[PDB]
Design a protein around this ligand. Structure first.
Ligand code: 0BD
Ligand code: CJJ
Ligand code: CJJ
Lengths: 260, 262
């Protein structure tokens, strides 16, 4: 769609915020409530296909099950036909753009935003859900330092391949924990663990190859925590975002990260 | 607005949670998103009156304007009778909590006071005054989270918690909400409201002229001071907003004296 488009005679679009996996994120107005909201609309070509509509209907129902200030909230879902998902409008920048300008984040910043993400993901984990795509691009950062987990689009290309779980790369809530570890690694050092020219290389590295060592400037408790999340076996790592967030909180207090 | 009823063919009303002044609070189901929501429906008596319809539309718009975990979120607004789709909170009004407990422990009372201050500061920063802060409007979850509700009489029942200036027909200000919260604070720590009597006029006149009765000597002085400052009759000599109030509570929690309002 374009700027002047009023979805179902209520949601008048304004600015195009981003262009995600299958849908476009839009800055919009609710004519009934008179408030600014974010609207996710399916791309012109995907709006015609029923496999892309039933994948988008799933994102709506999944996100609406979650209630946490660390999860971009869902208000509505409609079809005008253009399938749209009405959400909480967040004044933030993705961790994608943050780490591009800053390289890495300070020990205080990284561990605050890691626990924030774990406490956010545990809400999704306790409901029996798995995000399946935890990456800086799906983590929004407001100027007040608040994390907002977005895009549950594939909840059960090189983008997902850079932080993919080894079991997923082969064919669970431990996977979101794993991915967040890879996210943590990049945020604490300023360079991803597995890196290559292609997507299939980075994904194959995640299975057979062991993660490269972290810089020695990093404390032992932070180093250990990244290594417990980055194990090939999904049993040898934290079964959910919560036990992980609990282990992040220990490293924040000066303590060691526990064994799951 | 009867039980079974499915609003706009989407929101099935299940259980009447509460009955306010303008409308009813219902535990409902969003058949579209497949989630359990709370629906505020206009009382059938007022459902067709234009004065109440505008008052309900304003409440819908005011609440939707606020985004904070300590305030119950707005999802949708419709007219099937007007209805307001909101976040479903598994909580209990401070009203009923205090009826069972009598008085909250200093640790709990100060935690609920801080949370309410922080939540109201969002509305105050937006330039809105709640105008009806009372224990019945403060939801408490089993995890101990405060959820602020009912912006029905908010400006850009009341009697027991009304601010002196608010009783004197003065313009609304965030300091008025600060006073009302101090009345909730006085009640939470002592198990008794400061001003009493049959008839609202007496209670309202007590908020204007009568000084609040002394708090139990069993209480810490840092706590007693915080309540005493918030209950000043002059809003200029009181905490400006929910934020400054919450900061003074944070100082008391840390075992310090509350800072003097700016
Ligand atoms: C303070 C208000 C909201 C009123 C109070 C109700 C009254 C009737 C007793 O609610 C209690 O609040 C405390 C403090 O948050 C909770 O403990 C947890 O507090 C946490 C806060 O840090 C954690 O330490 C831990 O989960 C505690 O158990 C209780 O589970 C909850 O029942
Ligand atoms: N979802 S995505 O495609 O990963 C994605 C990529 C980039 C996104 C982005 N960037 C900047 C801002 Cl200011 C923003 N605001 C939002 C977004 C949302 C929710 C509806 C998705 N609420 N507020 N969003 S969102
Ligand atoms: N708003 S009121 O009339 O003061 C009022 C009095 C009592 C209320 C109450 N009691 C128990 C529960 Cl479990 C509950 N849950 C809610 C309610 C909402 C909607 C209204 C914001 N979300 N979750 N609400 S609400």
């Amino acid at each position: 769609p374009r700027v002047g488009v009023t979805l179902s005679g209520r949601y008048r679009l304004q600015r195009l915020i981003a262009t995600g996996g299958m849908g476009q994120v839009w800055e919009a107005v609710d004519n009934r409530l008179g408030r600014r909201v974010a609207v996710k609309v399916l791309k012109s070509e995907f709006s015609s296909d029923p496999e892309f509509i039933e994948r988008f209907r799933a994102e709506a129902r999944t996100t609406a099950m979650l209630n946490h200030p660390g999860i971009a909230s869902v208000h509505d879902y409609g079809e005008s036909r253009t399938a749209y998902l009405v959400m909480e409008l967040v004044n933030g920048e993705p961790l994608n753009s943050v780490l591009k300008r800053t390289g890495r984040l300070s020990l205080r910043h990284a561990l605050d935003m890691l626990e924030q993400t774990g406490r956010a993901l545990q809400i999704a984990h306790a409901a029996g859900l798995v995000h399946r795509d935890v990456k800086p691009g799906n983590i929004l950062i407001t100027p007040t330092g608040q994390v907002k987990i977005t895009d549950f689009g594939i909840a059960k290309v090189m983008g997902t391949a850079q932080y993919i779980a080894p079991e997923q790369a082969l064919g669970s809530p431990a996977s979101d924990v794993y991915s967040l570890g890879v996210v943590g690694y990049e945020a604490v050092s300023g360079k991803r663990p597995f890196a290559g020219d292609g997507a299939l290389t980075v994904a194959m590295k995640h299975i057979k190859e062991p993660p490269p060592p972290l810089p020695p400037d990093l404390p032992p408790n932070v180093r250990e925590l990244i290594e417990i999340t980055l194990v090939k076996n999904p049993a040898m790592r934290y079964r959910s975002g919560g036990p992980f967030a609990d282990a992040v909180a220990a490293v924040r207090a000066g303590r060691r990260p526990p064994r799951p």
